[PDB]
């Protein structure tokens, strides 16, 4: 099955998910001189209820914090979006060194990690599953992490990691103030793209925040101790789980700021 090791990692994904070589794949190199300022873009309109988070789990490919998406308590609107996108999922990508962990890369700068916040269009689709298959279905907010001061909200997550070391393990996790985790500036770039993991669907409006948030090197390194293997199977660690940048193929990357 797909992963990030030699035999199953990103260069091999196309073997099983041919859309891996499609025309709207993510992540991308963000080249600031090539981005177009677009005054029609709106500020982000962000509403995240800390009681929405319910469960943290090891998928084998990241941790996922799962939110109750029963109704519209936590929604992202504005930015480049038409309509309201409901909070589903948060997860993180990193690498084996603090030097190079993010998925989007900004004029050659890879950050230590990248947080993705996944939302779905409940104004047009009845469920996350239906939305994940359509071009306007998903919106993912990307937030870079750089090494700096320990992050008190991320410490809540690192504290759970011992309990979800094995693939498939979950534990209850709530009261996660996602809104306060975001950087002080919400200026962003946006472009049409895809999920960065299989099935790689071209369903995502990406919103990548320019300003990183910090994490300590100690906190970040606790993520690499997750296993990508389930209880009772040869142990292998999830030391790195970022996909390389993909060709832009004529897509417009827009900035909400100049
Ligand atoms: C139909 C499957 C969707 S679950 C999922 C996702 F929706 C993402 F956007 C991402 S991401 N990295 O594109 O934001 C992700 F990693 C996921 F696991």
UniProtKB/Swiss-Prot annotation:
Lineage top rank: taxon: Eukaryota
Molecular-function GO terms, alphabetical: carbonate dehydratase activity; zinc ion binding
E.C. code: 4.2.1.1
Activity regulation comment: Inhibited by acetazolamide.
Catalysed reaction, written as an equation: hydrogencarbonate + H(+) = CO2 + H2O
GO cellular component, one term: cytoplasm
Requisite cofactors: Zn(2+)
Tissue expr: Expressed in thymus, small intestine, spleen, prostate, ovary, colon and testis.
Residue ranges annotated for the Alpha-carbonic anhydrase domain, each copy included: 1-257
UniProt record similarity statement: Belongs to the alpha-carbonic anhydrase family.
Designated name of the protein: Carbonic anhydrase 13
Gene source species: Homo sapiens
Gene it is expressed from: CA13
């Amino acid at each position: 099955s797909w992963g990030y090791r030699e035999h199953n990692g990103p260069i091999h994904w196309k073997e099983f998910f041919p859309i891996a070589d499609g025309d709207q794949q993510s992540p991308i190199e963000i080249k600031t001189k090539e981005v177009k300022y677009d005054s029609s873009l709106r500020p982000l309109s962000i509403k995240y209820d800390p009681s929405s988070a319910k469960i943290i789990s090891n998928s084998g490919h990241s941790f996922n914090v799962d939110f109750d998406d029963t109704e519209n308590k936590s929604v992202l609107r504005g930015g480049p979006l038409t309509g309201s996108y409901r909070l589903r999922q948060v997860h993180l990508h990193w690498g084996s060194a603090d030097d190079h962990g993010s998925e989007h890369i900004v004029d050659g700068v890879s950050y230590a990690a990248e947080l993705h916040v996944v939302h779905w269009n409940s104004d047009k689709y009845p469920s996350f599953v239906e939305a994940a298959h359509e071009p306007d279905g998903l919106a993912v907010l990307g937030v870079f992490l750089q090494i700096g001061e320990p992050n008190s909200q991320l410490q809540k997550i690192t504290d759970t990691l011992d309990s979800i070391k094995e693939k498939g393990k979950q534990t209850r996790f709530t009261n996660f103030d996602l809104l306060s985790l975001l950087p002080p500036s919400w200026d962003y770039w946006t472009y049409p793209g895809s999920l960065t993991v299989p099935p790689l669907l071209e369903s995502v409006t990406w919103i990548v925040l320019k300003q990183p948030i910090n994490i300590s090197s100690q906190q970040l390194a606790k993520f690499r101790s997750l296993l990508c293997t389930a209880e009772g199977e040869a142990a292998a660690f999830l030391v790195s789980n970022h996909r390389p940048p993909q060709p832009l193929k004529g897509r417009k990357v827009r900035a909400s700021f100049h």
